[model samples]
Target: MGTIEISSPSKTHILAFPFPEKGHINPMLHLCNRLASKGFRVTLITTISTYKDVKNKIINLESIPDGTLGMNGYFNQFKNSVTESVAGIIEEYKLGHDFPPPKVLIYDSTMPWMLDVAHGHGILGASLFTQPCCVSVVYYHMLQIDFHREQSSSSKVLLLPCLPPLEDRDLPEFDYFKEDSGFVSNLLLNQFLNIDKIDYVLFNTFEMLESEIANWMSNKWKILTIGPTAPTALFETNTEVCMKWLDEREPNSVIYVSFGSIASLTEQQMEEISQALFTTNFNFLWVVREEERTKLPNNPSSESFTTAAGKLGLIINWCPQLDVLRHESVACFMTHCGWNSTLEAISSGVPMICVPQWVDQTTNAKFIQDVWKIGVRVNNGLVKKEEIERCIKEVCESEKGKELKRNAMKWKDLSKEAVSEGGSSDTNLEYFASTLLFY
Candidate 1:
């Protein structure tokens, strides 16, 4: 894509300062690319470790000066170092002639302390709650009720504001509500501390997909929906034998499976997945890491399935996931339902067969089936080969699959609009970057 040209674009300096986490940084990287592409003067502020991962390539990154934000120091200094480092950078920017003190600073939502640093420098501040809006809504409301560990863990349905009846089982991080709220829990709660004073808040999901929660959150605060920014994978122009292989398949003929190294399936689980994919007899491609391919070989069912590939499925070491999902030949995604994976599936209009593992992913599965109506689940916490097969059948054949496909496609269209020029997210971001009152 070519860059957006500017005739008289007043250089409005904007700062993208994210929490030093991969999940956090990736979104910010894409956000910066968008902001910079829109002709705004954008700066990415990161400490050394994160700076190393990005390597000053996508956008020119300015690292926080040496000892001020050392990642290896006393663990407690982590937060304070970044806090000081931000203000230190703003001070340096004050002396620069190239750009003005940043007009706005978008910090990761977890660092509640960044608001003060932003306001401290007269920079309009917004916290980028770098997860699906439902997540922030759930976690924020989790702190609202006087929930005890015993009560939250029971089968009681949590009547949290603006959510479907959530069972304790869906809550993977429920322990955070413990009376002795630990450091991380405390930090998460701290995010909402001065939330009322901040003029705008940003999330990584767009408005149309999570409209109900989006409405409720808007009534509560100036929340800005600026994403569906899920396209993290790149498909190079032309070439790759895999794309050629994919080209030969019929549209929506394949069941694409991947668990992506985050969680390792027990051998039984892996064998069950293999058997299910084979028995369904769909044109399937399962991404098996080199380390785990042995388990499939040990299972006779998996053996003949791949041995006579065209009649059954294909097993490969790796594939460009978004590239595969975006391909018309791939139909359903069988995944662990990580937020990124879930977003990727939705963004591509690919329905899912969710096999969630832990943390936010379980919640994500609930949203996929119940909220978004875009997928089926295997309940892998307690699944058999039969359940996997059943879920596959539903996603690829049942009436549920048709509705799922419709909703996923609807979401895909909405995602496209939200990022397009003058769309909801696009407008919200443009307004946030340029028009929120400056002191």
Candidate 2:
């Protein structure tokens, strides 16, 4: 059970499906890449835009054709065609190549419909949960709840097992996008539709992260914590420019800032942060997306910002994030605490200064500041620029800052061990691999 050895796994085949988006696809790809590198044939489903890099590693990419369309229309249409399309692809594989039957279908847990198709193909369906265990359990409990059944009120606290008491703000509040009769809410709840039947639930987290939650969750399903899975810096931009710039800076003196790809800040909030960065006087590297760049104070000419001429920090709209975070000069991460960003910060061993926007970020920020003690937050969601300055000083200069970096390094080591050979996540993944290889 400790070190699974699957010799000559050429006949072993695994099918993976991820919800078509950045967050979902990234972790799934990381998992697929790891499996493929271990000499397993993994065919990842979805996309007309296939990757050439993964092909050599033995990950076969299959594309589903969708005629056209965005927000509302796109999702419904996307699901409509893909149902039959996936089946047809399964049928094609079933029909030709003297192919060994797929042993497991590692479908994104969000698409429970695939469970039915996996069963139809006589393959086991493995629920690949992309979210952190904390978020997944929160939603699963919500799905189990009945608000109309009493002992509930607007002013009351909601208690979850093995977690801190929660306010409504700390919970999933997609009602903001509930515009059409709880469309988003229903779609979210739909993820657990067939959960009672799933045999394997794989989380993109590690064994050491949450002992209480992990222990509590294992009672409900055959759970395997196989990740902290992320890519290996495949998307390198002109490494010369950023690397040379970073090499010029002193070690641990730069604060690397970003808010992931989709978050936006108000002009006032942007100016507040801009002022704080200027005053904090710690060398900084911030990613202000192009559309959001104009919101920053003293907006520099594009080329001027990139060259770092008269500025205290450099601003770029795009960057090789993993490279930047792991650089010697990166002192800490200023993040929106999106799940991916949180994991990245931890993996890079950089403490966070969280300025969360919405969704799971508030919860992630809560864990970062309160739970993990690896950084400071802006004292709830939006705050005065002074709070930003205070947060910066607290994490960069105070005794608390030292402790936080210590804790950051702690989790960072745990993350590394879980992915290394014979480590917890690596062993679990291999066990999953070899067990299914038996079929």
Candidate 3:
């Protein structure tokens, strides 16, 4: 083959600030990769603590990984270490004359302070709400007015308002609860209250999927739909190793399970899921964390299917997730319903069995089951192996599960369309670059 010439455009920098959490970081990274490929000077600003594994790779790219400096100490002052570290990064960026400060900044919506910093610096800023477009519309509508605490609490389970077919269970967790009355509730409620701070809002979804919500947000706020980021990018690049694993699995036979980055299930919960998987006698792949102290009780004989299938479960610390999902043997995904996982599952055309742990994950699970009809929901708080087995079979082998797979395939096609040349998301990305950067 002839040598291909790769050229980068001379341009201002586009900096991306993703919250340290896995859900936010993955999309931001994908977007940064795409932007870099497009020749935009891209800097992915993330905390040092989070990217410990990828530090060498980032430095190798010759890009400034902003959180590497003594920024960690500044974050130590806050009670919530995660947000504190992220806020520290933003504050540091605001103060220091670091490399050419970003001409345009795109950040996760959870970081409200970035808007103030961007406005103060006269830099164009956009909030990339790492949730669905419908979820954004829900927040925007709720922001117009406030209701009583009890009312807001009751509202948490309310189905979507505008979308005719959207169900209460399918609406993201925010759709269910409008106000925060407790500690965890208030913590999450605070993120939504600051939605109006940024000049624009970007959703990790497409207009074709939520046209009404997209149009409504476009009219009311600077809204753009730019995802299923993981799926689009992963499918486009098509890594062979990930695809090869899928090739080995039987169609609609393997059970893919992931608990998301932050969800720490009690040891009992893990055992229950394990038992359920064992009882079902199904092939499985589970992504588990080493941080949890939980261990499996009743260690069955090695060859027994209970132990064997459990061993077959493939308890990996982490994998090339997209590659795993696209595996043909992966019949169903049992996930914490984090946005990135949701996007990846949808992009891979695999159905889900959602067991959302917290935050907007509950909402994402709702949308997956109720709105998209591409998955089913499992109770996160008290999970049992039998229930896990049943749901896994229901979504992977049953008629309902087959239908879900079909819906997932349709979504996968749409996700590809959204990112392609001249697509809605593709055009909006161009707008973000030209209007925000060049203007």
Candidate 4:
């Protein structure tokens, strides 16, 4: 037999497995890129089909077979495959002399089971919560309190130790109210229950942004606060049309509206939103998914929509959100209060008009309006056109809007400061990198 030669293993390796959704994937990709920049070998484990769809900069992409593409019924099988595939990847890498065994496995919060798999292989698994620490704390406490067994009405207020009191309505709707359809509510509860089993938890928020809850979680669990993990404007985009439209508008004049990637608007909701846009008479840029547009109740003709909007509104499938938020023309954001959107809005210094739909959005909306004092939330759990119009005016035209803008700018400055050299988040990230490097 010929003599075999093996190359030396690399210094360190980190494997990241994000839930296969835009909101989950984007931040995880950003984290992976950051790790690679720090000289660590980073591999992103995703489904074979999803890996093809993602436009990524990372050179190391590994694909796992996704059992069922869209069939929600087979989700457990899919998750099981993902967990097993990760273990298989670790074993395969062990056979390679050129790559080190993974030092850390960073996974989406949705897959707490990944932690068990990581520990089985003697690798550290850090739960990457794409949502804010506030939301995570709420879920953690819900598990502690046995929220599922409680018979409180949705309107009743419940208090958690070391966190703000929340009405049952303000908790994740799936956790407190929704019937278990084997997809959302139960999955969320299971994920929360597994929190204590993880090596550590990672949040995409800085300490200053959520100091109280962040500290509380840290005291209870091994935690790292190394985020607002959104990349800076390091890359430019080809958004000439969007830029040109905003250029024609005056500073602090446009209302930027989006419901995020996952939230779906009902036909009635769409009609109400359209009517509100018409009533507000404010210059607006609205992002409505193309597939969802077909479901609109009235299905207004383009000509009619244009006539009604009359240059006050521009409808598009999507635009570069961070770029738009940073523009001088944008006054306030009408948003679903998704954690990514909330952080971006805060970073951009744009006040928001919160119109939460479900999940952690309600919790985030509460923080935006009550805790941060940089935005206003829609009242009464109904999306009437008049209420929408009122919210727009409150954030864009009222004296209260001016105060909101000032508070937003204050937080914006703090956010930038936290990410700068020698800042809190910057130091935390460096420490985190060191931990992995030496582990």
Candidate 5:
């Protein structure tokens, strides 16, 4: 959303295909916008339903027919449809002769089948890892060395060549390794198997944030770090009311809590969080789906939840997250530690209380607490009220909290520098664009 000027105009076309999920779509669209702003003709490809959801947010989007939305076998069928649709689009462009055929295809890492589609058409394909470089690097190593077969059942430590040695618990739970379910393992295997086929991999992070891992990844694979990939103020909307609410609060006085789009809390867990908030008695802004409201401690009574929450905080179905983080009133984020949320909090200079839920999140929480020195992780997975209260108070009112705040601000400055013109991420983007033109 800032000034990104291209001196020369060429008909270099890129087609972006992202997984049909909010977390995935947001960053992919951000990248597409940046590419389009630099004078590349960019078209975002998705299902018709997703296109309808994002048409206002993106430009030059094309959609395929909708597939079954909630069936068990839908993902395989959807992948087939997308591949067929992309092939048809390529053929149509070649036949029309009014524009150059797509030279590059960018797709979400979850949908590796698209790489095959791109190769079939002789187009360069890049995989976008919406998670952090650390997660990607770990997965890369896991594929190279069969950890499940080699490591003893009692062995908890995992040693990778260039990465910090990790506990088996901290590593992402691939289905094959954990024997939890085979679905995720199968998809991840497909993703890594095709890594050798992709032109390169893209991360939604900056080099300075993960220099060691990024450098190591580049040495082993063709990779690029072209992000924070966060939405600028110009691109945000529906933020007026929340912004107004934040405007009325004191500077650095409110705790902003959101567990991202997919994480769900059990009723007991919600009760624990509710009790913790009440115990802390700190000003807070919490985002919970309207349907999940019943799970809170006090519900369906004569007293409204808002009335109960009065003065202490506000609870709403949704709040503009980036806008909330950028607000001066937001002191810290109590987050699920999803990579996008983690980056946004870092860019906003807000410290965090990491409450990670699932895959890659546990590792992110470890980074926030142990590596970045910007936040503290919960002692255990159990969301006890006491632990919640203690973590919140520690981040909000202690000497440790001040230290976290200082570190957060430092990372925030670095994030801005990386995304600025002539900065590391910008330079990487320029190099990637050059490769597209010449390759």
Candidate 6:
């Protein structure tokens, strides 16, 4: 045989499989870009439905390859979507052409069943848990608690050893499994089983921030605490629109508002938020989907404002969020407290007005407002326009809000340190790279 030319793997090949939802896709996409920047070859897998999600529009697909598999249709249409998608990729890969088997499988908790595929292929499987370590620990321990046998329904109660104090109301709606095969219950139960199968698990939090919970999770499962992942990942993304927009505003003057990808508000919710924006004397940029505005009470016209002060408010269908957060003009964020949004705000040093919707969002809001002291929470998610106006005024103009900003910057500085050379995230990434070749 002729002399063989060997190519050393540059970083590592990562098969990042996130459930094809915008909220889930954003962080995983960001993470994949960061890994690629570090020289890792990444194969991001998603269904065709997820492929069309506007949030995933962050990257120009013309730039990447469709190397993985996908499904079509609405995420809720199980018969048309999920049922056909379940373990479908495995069959395709096995029967068709051959390619390199993945060395490491990094996935969201929702698709934990992929563990079986990983195990079958002798590949190392890791999970990117979107929730905090505290919540994950609670769920992991709750598996043993037998709360299900006695409880008639899922009740909101104060539970011990929770990362943030969780009311029974704050628990994920899927925590209880009363019905034989309800959607959320089965989802969580599957998530619970999937978590245990991974060789390593990753949380989107830093070691210093959640030392206690991180330590506990590490012992129970091979844990890699390399988050607030969005900070570094944001740098890898290309978002020029926000930069151009911020050039026209003063530093620390603009209010940023986003309701995350999945949470939709009725007309009352939009009008309330609108009235709040009208009330606050702050420059703001709000992202409202076209559908969200239609859900508003009056079909509030976007054409009313024309002046500089009125011009201070701009609403877009979707935004390059990481770009917006990094801009110096963003003073505070009014958000649904989704994990990716929370991490981005913290990483950017912007104080927040948290309005949680569902799942671990309530718990994350609690962590931000009560535990971290870096944010303020809106008690009601059903925010009326007048109340939204009032909350905006309070958050942007109050002394407490200013204090939150001060604290937020501290976390932001710490996050920068985490991703820098010799930082915890960088070091862990190095460790991950070293292990890939052996795998």
Among the numbered candidates, top TM-score falls to: 5
In candidate 4, what are the lDDT values of residues 1-439, reduced to their tens digit?
Answer: 7995532224788888999887888778878877787778888898877786554433388888875633355787887888889899988886788767778889998888888888998888888889888887776665556555363534567777656788765777664234443356555556677777887678888889898888888888858887877765423233676788889888877888999887887788888888888657568888877667785555332211332546467777766788899999998999999888899999999999999888889989988998889999988545889888888888888899899999999999888887778878888777777767551
Residues 61-90, candidate 2: write the lDDT tens digits: 887774244466877787777777777777
Query: Cα lDDT of all candidates, in order?
Result: 0.74, 0.76, 0.66, 0.79, 0.80, 0.67
Off by over 4 Å in 3: 1-9, 54-101, 141-160, 164-197, 231-248, 293-295, 298-311, 437-439
lDDT score at residue 261, model 2, on the 0-100 scale: 75
Best by lDDT: 5
Clash count, one per candidate: 0, 0, 12, 0, 0, 12
- Which candidate, 2 or 6, has the higher TM-score? 2
What would the per-residue lDDT of candidate 5 be over residues 239-319, giving only the tens digit for each residue? 676788789888887888889887788888888887777556467788887667787765321121332345457776777
Cα deviation of 36 in candidate 2 (Å)? 0.8
Per-residue lDDT tens digits for candidate 1, residues 238-277, read 2264576678878888898888654677788887777677
* Candidate 5 lDDT score relative to the true structure: 0.80
- In candidate 1, list every pair of residues with a backbone clash: none
- Residue-by-residue lDDT tens digits, candidate 6, 1-439: 6996543355345677776667777777767766777766677766655555533454222112222411322223533343334345434444544444457778787667667667766567877877777666666666555434323565545656526556654555443223422555545445678666677777777777777777777776768877766645333222454566667888888888889877787677777777677556677778777677776545432332433345477766667788898888988899988878888888888888877776667777778887888887776637665556555656668887777878998988888888788887667766666667762
Whole-model alpha-carbon lDDT for candidate 1:
0.74
Candidate 5: worst-modelled 10 consecutive residues by lDDT = 299-308
Q: Model 4: how large is the Cα RMSD against the reference?
A: 4.4
Give candidate 4 misplaced runs (Cα > 4 Å).
Answer: 1-10, 56-59, 69-72, 97-99, 146-154, 175-178, 181-183, 233-240, 297-310
Candidate 4, lDDT over the whole model: 0.79
The reply for model 1, stretches above 4 Å from the true place, is: 1-10, 52-57, 64-75, 149-154, 172-184, 230-245, 260-264, 287-319, 436-439
Q: Write the per-residue lDDT of candidate 3 for residues 1-439, one digit (tens) a residue.
A: 7995533233456767777666777787777776777667776766655555334323112222333223234333322443444345445655657444456677678666667656666676788888777655555555453323354355434434565444344434533332332333443444566666676677888888778767877876667788766535423222453355446656666777778777787778878887777656567766665565345544221121324444344455555688778777887888888877888888888889988876568667777888789998875347776777778778866888778888999998988898898989988877766665432
